[PDB]
Swiss-Prot record:
Source superkingdom: Eukaryota
Documented effect of changing F411L: In allele CYP2D6*97
CDD domains assigned to the protein according to its UniProt record, in alphabetical order: CYP2D
Record's protein name: Cytochrome P450 2D6
Annotated consequence of substituting R394C: >90% decrease of monooxygenase activity towards dextromethorphan and bufuralol
Binding site for substrate: D255
Length: 451
């Protein structure tokens, strides 16, 4: 077949309008094919999902204790080691969610802590990012370790700080070079420099896991994902094929922790920024909150079905926010065909999710914050096919149900008790974000006055 034509997200918008939705690039040793628009993305992740659910090899993960039966979930290669952890994490989230609503309970209570932390900043401008990280991180810790940490807890702060630094290391030029040739890691001085912040994050997490293993009561049903993991580890003793082992427990937990902490928080950070840039939208949400919930009762997930406008605003925050523009890289495990063109096995796939969320042929005004993107004339919530912030296919975000819950409950609770605005005397904050593998809003302050 014909190979795709050939010559950051702004650079891909030029290449798309010069070579089409499926073009190619040659980044050093790696052959890369970029996918643009819903059609091209769907064709790879859904139609040929069986052949595009693999990850590109990351040899430097061996420093972090990555093995064949211990690859975590996020970077895990397509196969049994991934499928077992994928199916486990998805099912455990569901099981902890249903029954007694443990998920909803921990989030609701964490929201109240977030509202209280905001209240102590009242009558004074501040950056909401730090508090959002802690509140979002605690929800994860409630699912993994079955606990939360105080906002001034020393180890908690260090855990969050190391996690934020570990994200920057992922986007380092030193990475790709060492990732290409693994024998460079044999250098003792060089090996410690590669992922010093990430390995620090692991070490700090180990200390917390060890403590948790002490308090775990096997005689009772697992309170959290780690306890559920530990319970499987005992059953998998004497089985070298199982991905349930000590080396993988610290990696899977680190995956779930890091993933749903920098994403959900950044989204909420975008959310509050769009609420002070567009106060009219904020008022309509707060009005719908009063008409459906009130101003004293805590928001519930059962309220979402009766709050179409708020649902549209949150969805539009994700769409406009566009926090993961280029998604997470895939890799072809076979030879496939995308939009007529041929894609060789082992080709690194890039899913330009930004081109889907900002598709001008789909959305009425893609480059604007327009809540009506998810509303019809009547006021009903509609969700277009092109809403893919969690990507699609087998590798689609397993944290989406939790994210949906965290976003609705945190966003509604904050607007229920606070009115957000720009601090007078300060410039109107740009709605353009600082580009990375994860797009955060441009640094801003806000005033949160109670109601
Ligand atoms: C606003 C919040 C979030 C967004 C926008 C988001 C987005 C994404 C994206 C784009 C991917 C890549 C999908 C692909 O490779 O095709 C992904 C994967 C993943 N996410 Fe999220 N995510 C969010 C929250 C979460 C949460 C809350 C968790 C866990 C509790 C989580 C855990 C994961 C994991 C483990 C993967 C890898 C799944 C796999 O490789 O099969 N994320 N997410
Ligand atoms: C969801 C995560 C996204 C980032 C960017 C990522 C990775 C780490 C470090 N990950 C570990 C390990 F799992 F590999 F062991 C050192 C503790 C972060 F601390 C933060 C991140 F965003 N990279 C990943 N490979 S998974
Ligand atoms: Zn526990
Ligand atoms: Zn309708």
């Amino acid at each position: 077949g014909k190979l795709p034509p050939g010559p950051t997200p702004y650079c891909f918008d030029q290449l798309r309008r010069r070579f089409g939705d499926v073009f190619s690039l040659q980044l050093a040793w790696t052959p890369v094919v970029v996918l643009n628009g819903l059609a091209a993305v769907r064709e790879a992740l859904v139609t040929h999902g069986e052949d595009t659910a693999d990850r590109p090899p990351v040899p430097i993960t061996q420093i972090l204790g990555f093995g064949p039966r211990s690859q975590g979930v996020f970077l895990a290669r397509y196969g049994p080691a991934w499928r077992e952890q994928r199916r486990f994490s998805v099912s455990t989230l569901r099981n902890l969610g249903l029954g007694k609503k443990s998920l909803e309970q921990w989030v609701t209570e964490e929201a109240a802590c977030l509202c209280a932390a905001f209240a102590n900043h009242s009558g004074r401008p501040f950056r909401p990012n730090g508090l959002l990280d802690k509140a979002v991180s605690n929800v994860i810790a409630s699912l993994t370790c079955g606990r939360r940490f105080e906002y001034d807890d020393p180890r908690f702060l260090r855990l969050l700080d190391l996690a934020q630094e570990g994200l920057k290391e992922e986007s380092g030029f030193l990475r790709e070079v060492l990732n290409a040739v693994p024998v460079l890691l044999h250098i003792p001085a060089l090996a410690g420099k590669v992922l010093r912040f990430q390995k620090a994050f692991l070490t700090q997490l180990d200390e917390l896991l060890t403590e948790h293993r002490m308090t775990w009561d096997p005689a009772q049903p697992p309170r959290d994902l780690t306890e559920a993991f530990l319970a499987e580890m005992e059953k998998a003793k004497g089985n070298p094929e199982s991905s349930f082992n000590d080396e993988n427990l610290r990696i899977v937990v680190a995956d779930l922790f890091s993933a749903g902490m920098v994403t959900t928080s950044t989204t909420l950070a975008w959310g509050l920024l769009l609420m002070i840039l567009h106060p009219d939208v904020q008022r309509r949400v707060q009005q719908e909150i009063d008409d459906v919930i009130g101003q004293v009762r805590r928001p519930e997930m059962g309220d979402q079905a009766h709050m179409p406008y708020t649902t549209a605003v949150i969805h539009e925050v994700q769409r406009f926010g566009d926090i993961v523009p280029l998604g997470v890289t895939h890799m072809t495990s076979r030879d496939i065909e995308v939009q007529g063109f041929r894609i060789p096995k082992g080709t690194t796939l890039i899913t330009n999710l930004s081109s889907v969320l900002k598709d001008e042929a789909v959305w009425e005004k893609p480059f604007r914050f327009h809540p009506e993107h998810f509303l019809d004339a009547q006021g009903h919530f509609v969700k277009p096919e092109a809403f893919l912030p969690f990507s699609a296919g087998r590798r689609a975000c397993l944290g989406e149900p939790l994210a949906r819950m965290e976003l609705f409950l945190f966003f509604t609770s904050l607007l229920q008790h606070f009115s957000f605005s720009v601090p007078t005397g300060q410039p109107r904050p740009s709605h353009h974000g600082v580009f990375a593998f994860l797009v955060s809003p441009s640094p801003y302050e806000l005033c949160a006055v109670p109601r």
